């Protein structure tokens, strides 16, 4: 790798980490607004099942 004019791999890494942080931020906002740690089964499936049974 050397001087490069048409692709920005460092920008790509920045965007990937930015989108990851954005996902995490939305999950945190959803958890805070709802008050529930488990809103979808992708959070905790077995936890969702046991909490629903309870």
């Amino acid at each position: 790798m050397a001087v490069n004019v048409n692709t920005n791999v460092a920008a790509m890494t920045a965007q990937r980490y930015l989108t990851g942080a954005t996902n995490a931020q939305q999950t945190s906002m959803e958890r805070l607004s709802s008050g529930f740690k488990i809103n979808s089964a992708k959070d905790d499936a077995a936890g969702l099942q046991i909490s629903n049974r309870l």
Binding site: R16, G20, S40, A41, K42, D43, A45, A46, L48, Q49
Partner: protein, 270 residues
């Protein structure tokens, strides 16, 4: 370059699949809430303080919620493509730059008349009353069945002497989770085997089973539950429990799908 370009398409398709799963799981969440409300209504109906009128009112509410469940199943869609009515079968979402690396997603029928939403009901022919008690030598009841794994199971429950019919039902409920026992007005022991823990008919043996004379099995679903009677409400409680377990299992499958697809998105980005 082809690869890079394809990797983006794969990321787009994975996001679309995640969105479809999320929409289906939200509709499922709503059906779960409706089922819990129906379960509470049926539990209220089973109480002996209600006369026929309260049971009819609870039945009206339950019919409204059943129609709501059917409407949710039949109307939820992703861009006009129905999801929870059963017409959506296994679809292969392509998450690879090269063909042949797709992952199949299946979503199941969420109508309240689906087999998966209920089970089988067996009602004892001989009814008991308040002064009936379990006799010696006629206290054992044996259920021979097979779970959804296929394994043959034999559950022997030895009811305590001097137990009335409702204590017998409570003992059967405590001793096993494969079947749910309850009692109706006439004192007949109803037994429910949901179509998520039992496959085929259930065989009854023993002295207590001979005394009760359990009848044939009828297929019950959420679409066919009625709480205008005590036994109807008692049985609909178990039917709704089976439906809730089925819906929760489907929700868990969709959540695992979404977690796998998020991992795939991260890997494809890398």
């Amino acid at each position: 370059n082809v690869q890079s370009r394809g990797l983006d398409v794969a990321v787009r398709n994975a996001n679309d699949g995640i969105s479809i799963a999320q929409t289906a799981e939200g509709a499922m969440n709503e059906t779960t809430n409706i089922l819990q409300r129906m379960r509470d209504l049926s539990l209220q109906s089973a109480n002996g303080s209600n006369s026929k009128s309260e049971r009819v009112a609870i039945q009206e509410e339950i019919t409204a919620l059943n129609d709501e469940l059917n409407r949710i199943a039949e109307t939820t869609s992703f861009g006009g493509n129905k999801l929870l009515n059963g017409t959506f079968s296994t679809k292969s979402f392509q998450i690879g730059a090269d063909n042949g690396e797709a992952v199949m997603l299946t979503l199941k029928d969420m109508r309240s008349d689906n087999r998966m939403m209920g089970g089988t009901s067996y009602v004892a022919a001989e009814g008991k009353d308040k002064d009936w008690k379990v006799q010696a030598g006629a206290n054992d009841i044996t259920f021979t069945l097979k779970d959804i794994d296929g394994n043959d199971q034999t559950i022997t429950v030895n009811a305590k002497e001097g137990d009335d019919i409702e204590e017998v039902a409570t003992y059967i409920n405590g001793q096993t989770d494969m079947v749910k026992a309850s009692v109706n007005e006439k004192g007949q022991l109803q037994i429910f085997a949901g179509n998520n823990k039992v496959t085929g008919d259930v065989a009854f043996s023993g002295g207590l089973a001979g005394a009760l004379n359990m009848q044939a099995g009828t297929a019950e679903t959420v679409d066919t539950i009625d709480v205008t009677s005590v036994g109807g409400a008692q049985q609909s409680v178990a039917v709704i429990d089976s439906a809730l377990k089925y819906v929760d299992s489907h929700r868990a499958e969709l959540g695992a799908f979404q977690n796998r697809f998020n991992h795939a998105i991260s890997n494809l980005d890398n």
